[PDB]
Amino acid sequence: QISVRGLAGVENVTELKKNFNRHLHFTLVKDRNVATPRDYYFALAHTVRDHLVGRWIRTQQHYYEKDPKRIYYLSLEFYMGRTLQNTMVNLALENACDEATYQLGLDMEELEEIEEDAGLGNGGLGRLAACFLDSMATLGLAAYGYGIRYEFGIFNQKICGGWQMEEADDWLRYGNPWEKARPEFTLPVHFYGRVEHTSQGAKWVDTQVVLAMPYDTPVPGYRNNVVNTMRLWSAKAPNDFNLGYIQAVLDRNLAENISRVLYPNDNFFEGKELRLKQEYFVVAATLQDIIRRFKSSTNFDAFPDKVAIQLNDTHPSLAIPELMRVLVDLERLDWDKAWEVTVKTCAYTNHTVLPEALERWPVHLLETLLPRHLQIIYEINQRFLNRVAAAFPGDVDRLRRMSLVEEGAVKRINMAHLCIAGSHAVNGVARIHSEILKKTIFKDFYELEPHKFQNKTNGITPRRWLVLCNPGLAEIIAERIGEEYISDLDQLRKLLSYVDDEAFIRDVAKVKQENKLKFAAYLEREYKVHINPNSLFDVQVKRIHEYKRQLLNCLHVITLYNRIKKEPNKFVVPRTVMIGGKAAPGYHMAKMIIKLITAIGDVVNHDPVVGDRLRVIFLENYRVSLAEKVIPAADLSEQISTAGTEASGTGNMKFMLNGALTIGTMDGANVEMAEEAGEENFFIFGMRVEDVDRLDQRGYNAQEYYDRIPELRQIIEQLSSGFFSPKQPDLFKDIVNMLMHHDRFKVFADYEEYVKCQERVSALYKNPREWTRMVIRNIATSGKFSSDRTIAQYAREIWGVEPSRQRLPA
Amino acid sequence: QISVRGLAGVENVTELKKNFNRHLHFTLVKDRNVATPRDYYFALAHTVRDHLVGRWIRTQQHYYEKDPKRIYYLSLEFYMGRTLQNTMVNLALENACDEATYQLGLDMEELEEIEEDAGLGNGGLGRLAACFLDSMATLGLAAYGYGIRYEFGIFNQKICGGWQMEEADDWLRYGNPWEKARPEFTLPVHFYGRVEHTSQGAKWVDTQVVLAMPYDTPVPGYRNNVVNTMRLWSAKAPNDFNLGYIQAVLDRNLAENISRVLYPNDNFFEGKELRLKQEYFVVAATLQDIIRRFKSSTNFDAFPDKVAIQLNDTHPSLAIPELMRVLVDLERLDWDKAWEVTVKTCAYTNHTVLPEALERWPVHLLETLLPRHLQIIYEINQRFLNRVAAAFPGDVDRLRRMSLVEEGAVKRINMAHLCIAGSHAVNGVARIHSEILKKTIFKDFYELEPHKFQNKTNGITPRRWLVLCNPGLAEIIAERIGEEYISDLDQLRKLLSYVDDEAFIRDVAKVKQENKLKFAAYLEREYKVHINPNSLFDVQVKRIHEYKRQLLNCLHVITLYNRIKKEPNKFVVPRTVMIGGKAAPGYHMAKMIIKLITAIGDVVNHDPVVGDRLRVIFLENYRVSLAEKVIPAADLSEQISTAGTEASGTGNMKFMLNGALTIGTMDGANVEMAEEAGEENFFIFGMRVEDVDRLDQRGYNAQEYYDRIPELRQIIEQLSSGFFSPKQPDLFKDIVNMLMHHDRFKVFADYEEYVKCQERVSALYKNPREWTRMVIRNIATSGKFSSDRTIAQYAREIWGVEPSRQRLPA
Ligand SMILES: OC[C@H]1O[C@@H](NC(=S)N/N=C/c2ccc(O)cc2)[C@H](O)[C@@H](O)[C@@H]1O
Ligand SMILES: OC[C@H]1O[C@@H](NC(=S)N/N=C/c2ccc(O)cc2)[C@H](O)[C@@H](O)[C@@H]1O
Ligand SMILES: OC[C@H]1O[C@@H](NC(=S)N/N=C\c2ccc(O)cc2)[C@H](O)[C@@H](O)[C@@H]1O
Ligand SMILES: OC[C@H]1O[C@@H](NC(=S)N/N=C\c2ccc(O)cc2)[C@H](O)[C@@H](O)[C@@H]1O
16 A cells, blocks of 8 residues: 555465465464454464564574674563564565455454553663664664563553552463463572582572573564564473472462562662562573573683673663672682673663662662672672772772662662673763763762763664554655665655655645544544544653653643633634653552643533633553554654653654654753754753752742742642642642642743743644644654664674674575 | 374375474474474474364354254363374374374374373373263264363372372473463353342342453364364453552462362362362353353253253362352242253262262351352252152151251261252262162162162273274284274174184284383383383272272282292292372372382392392372373283272273283272173172171271281281381381271281282283183173263263264365
8 A cells, every 4th residue: 555564466465365364274263253353363463473483593593603792682671562563564564464454354453453562661761672672683783682571561551530540461361472482491590598608619509499481572673584582581480399289389379470570660669579589580591591602602701702781770780790600609710800701791771860760779688589699799899999999099988989888777789889880881871861970970980980981872763663653654755765764764864855845744744634633533432532633732641750740741731721711712722732651559649640630631621611722631551552653643742851850761752753843851862852953943941950950059949939920829729729629629739739848850940931932832833834844854853863873882882793784585 | 004093195194294394483483403302292283283173163163053962071170191192093193193203204102202191180080081071072972071271280299218299290381282272251250259139139249250261172083073172261360350569460379379270189078268269160160151152052941951061070069059040140030940950951970989088068168258159059958858858757867867068066068969959860980889879878869869860880982092002902903803993892892702813812912012011111211120021010000099908909019028038939920010109198198008119119129039020119100191001011900999989990991901801809890890701701809898898887807817817917017017117117107007906998808818819810820821811801891891882871861962973074
C-alpha cells in the first residue's frame, strides 16, 4: 500500500500464506472454524519469527569466526513493547504480511493489537535500553543485552473513581513466541555463606545456590540481516532444594521469587533485600557467561580488548566487585592486574541527580548476602582513598565525601562512588546533565580523574518511533528524500528546503489530522470518551513525578477553565489536554496528582458553558504500545520539569520526530533540541538552572507568588475549599500544603511564564500554515536524537569499536 | 528391521528426515554443529507430534457431529511414562523413524532415553488410568481423561548410604512437547466463602477464586486414527489477586500451589487441606467443562444418556455434591430430579480395603473450605438414611454404620459411603476384591442395593506392555499367529498349540536371554554393578509397603545366604534377586525396609564364599520407564502380598505377558491369573483369605513360628545382633519388634510355605526346556488381562456404550 513498508512480491505472499496455515494447523492445533483472533495473531507471530532464524544463527556464527570485541549492555530494565510490527519493519516484511493476511480474510492491524507489551521496565531508562539494542544491531555491533526475565512486568493501571489501582502484568500467560529457552546454558548463582581464608586465597563457602536459566530473544537490525541477542535470566531452584516433603517442594518458590516481579520505582531507591538479590543474580550469571565466551575464543590481559561491559545506572554495579572476585579468588590473578582489567572493561552511565534515586545499600545487608563482595568493596575503597589522599594531601573532608562507605546511623555503600572508581568512563545522558555531574554531585571525582567524564546525549530509534508508529509521516518524507534517512536520520535536514513548499506543508498537516482522527476514534471505541479532533492536542505523557510537574500543567488547565467561566462568550483556541502516566505504588503524592487530574476532568468535561472548547483526559495505562498511538497524534509536547531535574528525557525526542511542537524548560535534552531547531521554533519558558540556584540561596517562598498573582490565588482557594471535590472538601489539602510550604520543585515560580508561553502557543495554532512550517523545522532538525548517533558515540568514544552499515549475507 | 514395528517406506522416510531438519532449525534454533542429544530428541518429538494433529482435530470434529455419549474418567493420577515410543507404536511410525534417524546418523534408542517420564501418579492406580486411556482410544470410545497437571510428579529416588532420599521431579524443566496449553478455556474455581439463603435458593458468596487452566495431551488409539484427549488443569491466580504491591504479586504463589505437587502416598490417607483443595479443583473445573460441552450439543433428563463420569477411587468424590450444587443452586432443578441425574451419571471404582487408605475428611475442613458442599452432603445423608430406616426398620446400628457422617472426637465424612450413595455402579478391581467388598467393608450397602455392585478385573495395555517394551517377544509371536493379537489379546491362546514346537521353545528362551543380557548391560553402564546373566532373575518391583511383604522376600534371601554358608560346596541355582520401589516419604517402616534390602546386599554381594551364586540388588528409582526395561528381563515375578490385601495388582499381569513365571499368594488378580493359566503353571503358596481370617479369630502369635522354625530364629538373631549392621548393631530393632509383636500382615505365617515353594522354582529352572514350556502356557493364557477387555466391560456394563474396532478415515 505505502512505499516504506517494503515489497509485496508474489512468491513472498504465497509463501507467507502457506506458512501461516501450517502454523495454525500444526503449531496451534486449530482449523479456521474454531480459531479466535488470538490464534490468528499467534500463527502470524510464528510465521514471522521463522524469518529470524537463519539470520540469527548466521550472525552468531559470524561473531564466532571474526571474534570481534563484544559489547555487554547490563540493565535491570528492557522496556521492549510489542515485537510483531518491529520485526516486520526490520525485515521489510510489513506489506507482504499485510497482503498475505488480507487474502486470508484478516486485518493485520487487529491482530497486532492482541500482542501484550513486554513491559520489562518503568519508563525512560528501560526504554533507552530497548532503543539501544535496536541501534546496536542496526550498526552491526557484536552486542548482547543482559537482564532479568520478570514474570510480572510493570503493573497494568486501572482508574477506579479517579484513583490508580494496580493489577499484575501477567504478560506470559499465553506464552511468549519471541523467546527461546536455553535450559542447557543454566548457571549457578551463590548467596549468603561465609568467607574462609586459606594459605592461598579467600574462599566463599556454605552458600545457598539459585539457578539462572537464560531465555534468548533476537534483536534484528534494520534491513542489514544482523540479528543480535537479548539474554534474560529466570530464577530456578536446584532439584535437591530444601531436600516435610510437600513443604520442601513448595518452598522452591522462595528461590524463584528472584525473577518474579519488576520493582515499579521510577527515580526512587528502595533498599529491599529482594531487589539486591535481583541485582546480584543478573550480574553473577552474566559475568560467568561473559567469561565462558571469552575463554572459548588464561591471557586476561586481552579481556578488555575483547569485552566491554556497560552498566545501565548503578543497578548492575555489583559487576565491578564480582569481576574482581572471579579474577582474584578463582583465576588467581594479583589484585592490581585484576583491577586494571576491571577498570578497562567497565563503564558507567548515570541517569539521575535526584539524591533519593541514588542506590546506597546498608552494610548489614551486603554482609549477610554477599560477604566476600563487601570485603572486596572495603579493599577497593581503601586503595581508592589512598590515591585521593596522595593527590589532595591533608584534605580530610574530601576523603569522607569520596568514600564508597558512608558513615551515619546505618553504614551504607554508595554504589555510584563504586561505579566511578571501577570504570574507565562515566557519562551523563544530555550535555547539561553531564555538566551538572562535573560541577556538583561528582565534582570531587571529576577533579581526581577528569578523563573519565563524558557526555552521551540520549536518542530514540527512528524505526519504532517514526516508521512503525507513523507510517504516513515516514512515507511523505520518503517521497521527497528517499528512504535512506531511516538509518541515517541526519538526512531529515534536507527537509529544510521544503519549508515553503505548498504541497509538503499540506501533506505534513494532513498526516497529523489523520493521526488525530485515528486516535480520537481509538478513544471512543475502547474507552467511550468524546473528543473534538479539531482541538489542539495538548499532551503530557510520562511517569507521574513531582519533578516532572504534571501539577504545573494542572494549574494551567484550571487557569484556562477559570478564564472561560469569566468571559464565556470570548473565543479561545479549543484544546484537548491529555495527561497520562503511572505512579509508583508507594508514592502517595503521585497518586494524589492522578486523582487531581481526573477530578479536574470531572468538573471541566461536564460544564455546559465550556462546551467542546476544553477537554481534560487522563490517559489510562500509559505504556510503549500507547505511546506509539498518542505521540503521532500530538500537537503540543509538554516537557516542563524544573530545570536541573530531568537528566535527559526521551519522550521529548519522540514528539519532536512526529510533528508536535514543544513547550518546555531548559532542562535535560530540551536544551539541545532547542539548539538544533532554533529557539524561535521552540516554546521555551521558565527558570534556567542558574535561576533555580539563585532562588535556592535566597530561599524559595511560595507565599510570595500566592500573594502577587490573583489568578494563582483563586486556583489555590478552589483546591482548598473543595470546588474540585464537593463531597470530600479537604481531599486535596496535602497538595495545597506541599505547594505552599514544601515544594522542592518550585511549581509557583514558573507559573506566570508558563501561562504566558501557553498563550503564545494558542496564537500560533490560530495560523495553521505557520504552525506547520514550524513543525517542519522541528522534524527537519530532529536527526541528532537518533539512537544510531548515540550508539555510534558510545562505540567510538567508550567501547573502542567501529560501527558498520554493511549487510551480512542474506 | 522387525515386522511388528511397521513399514519404512521411501516417501515416509524422506518426509521424516526433512521435517526433522526443519524442526531442528526453525523450532530448536540449532544447526548440526551445536546440537546436543537433547536437541535431537526434541526435533524427533516435534516431528512425531505433527502426525497426531490431523487425526486429533478430525476425531474431536467427529464427536461433535455424531454426538455420542461421552466418558469422563476423573483421576488425581495419570502415570503416563514416556510418550515418544508409544506414539510411534500407535501410529505405525517406529521403523520409519528408526530408519530416518539412522540415515541422519542418530541412534533413536539413545534419543528415547532422554525423555523424562510423565510421573503423574504413585503406582498401580495411576498406571491403571494411563492403560485405560490407551484402551479407550483403541476401542473408539469418546473418552476424556481429566486430572491435574502437577508441576512436580512423584519424586526421584536416590539411595544414599542405603537410605532413600527424595528429590523434586522437575519434569517440565525443558518443556513438555506433548501438551497443548488451552488458556482460552480457563475456568474459575471457588473456595471458602459462606452460604446465604434467599427466597429462591441457597447462594455461595464471598469466595476466593482460583483459575483452572487446561492443558490437552492427545491419546492415540492403536492404528485406528482415533486420538482422544487427556485434559490436565493447572492452577493460576486471577490478575487482581490480593490487589504491599510486591508482596501481593509474590502471594500469587499461594493460589498456584494447588497444582504444584503430587501427594506421594500410595495406599495411605493424609487429611491435609492442600490435598482437599486439589480434589475440589479438578472436580469443579472438570464438571463446568462437562456441562459446557453438554449444552453445546436445558433438558437435563438427557444428561445421563450423554454423560458418564467414572470416579477413580474416592479422590474425585466431590463430583457428586458438586453436580448436585450446580443442578440445584444454578440450574434450579428440584432436589429429587437432580439426584436422579447424578446417580445415573456417576460410577465409583474402589481400589483398596485397607482402613488407613480410606478418605475420611474432618467436618471442620469442609465447613471452612466448601460450606455449601457440606450442607449438600448432610442433606444426602439424611435422605439416604431415611431409605435405610425404611428398609431395615429399627436397625439402629445399621444407621450409624452406613452414615456418611462418622461420629467421634472429630466428626468426619466417609467419602466411600458418599460414593456408593451417589453412584449407580460400584466396582472392585479383581473378582476376590469385589467379593470382599460385598462380604465385609460394604456389606450393609450391598444388602440395601445389590444391583449397584460389580466386578471389573484390572488389565494392562498390550501396546506399552508387550509391543513397546518387548519387541522381540512381540515379533516371534507375530511370526506364528499374525499381528491381530495386539488389539485382541485373547488370540494369544493360539500359542498353546506351539507348546511342544521346538523352534518356538528355542525362540521364546532366546528372547528372554537377549532381554536379560540387555538389562545386565544396562546395570553396569548407568550403575556400575556386576551381575551374572545366567542366573535366575528374581524380581519384586512395586511401591514399598508392609502389606506387599518385601520383608518376606528379604527372609527368603537371608535363608538362601545362610544355607550357602552352611554347605558352601553344594550346588544351588544361581539367582539375581532384584527388589525395587519407592517408599512414601513419611512412611518410616518402608524406609527401614529399603535400608534392610541394601544392608543385606552389602553382606551378600561381598562374601567371597557366595561368589556369583547369589546377588541382591536394590533397583533405584523404580518408575514406568524402568518397568519397561526390567519386566522383559525377569524370570520370576514376586507377587507375595498377604491374601486379602492387594486389591488386584497389575504388575503381576505385566510379568505374565513378558515371559516370567509367578510365585504368589491367592490374592487380588493372582487368583484369576492362576485360574487362566492352570494352577500347575503357577507357584502358589501360603494362606488363602479364609486361613487369614481363621488366624485372626485365634490371634496371630508370631512367637509360635519363631519357636518352631530354627532357620527363621537364626535370621531374627542375625537381624537383632547386628550381623547386617555391624557399626550400628541395633539399627533394625524396629523391624524385629514389628515382626515379633505387631505384624498386621503375618510375614512369619507364610515363611515355611514360601521357602518350600521357592525350592520348587529352583528345581524347574534347572530344566530349561520345561521352564520355557510353562512360560509359554502363561503367555498363551494372559489374554484376559488386556485393558481392552477391562474397558469393553466398563463400556457395556457400566457406561452403556458399545466399543468399536473400526478405523476413522486417515
Ligand atoms: O511458543 C511458546 C514457547 O516458545 C518456545 N520457543 C521455541 S520451542 N522455539 N522458539 C524458536 C524461536 C524463537 C524466537 C525466534 O525469533 C525464532 C525462533 C520458548 O522456548 C518458550 O519459552 C515459549 O513459551
Ligand atoms: O514446545 C513446548 C511448549 O509447547 C506448546 N505447544 C504448542 S505451542 N503446540 N503444540 C502443539 C501440539 C502438541 C501436542 C501434539 O501431539 C501435537 C501438537 C505447549 O502449549 C507448551 O505448554 C509447551 O511448553
Ligand atoms: O537516560 C534515560 C532516562 O533515564 C531516566 N531515569 C530513570 S527512568 N531512572 N533513573 C534512575 C533510577 C531508576 C530506578 C531506580 O530504582 C533507581 C534509580 C531519567 O529520569 C530521564 O531523564 C532519562 O531520559
Ligand atoms: O486398581 C489399581 C491398583 O490400585 C492400587 N491402589 C492404589 S495404588 N491406591 N489405592 C488407594 C489410595 C491411593 C492413594 C490415596 O491417597 C488414597 C487411597 C491397589 O493397591 C492395587 O492392588 C490395584 O492393582
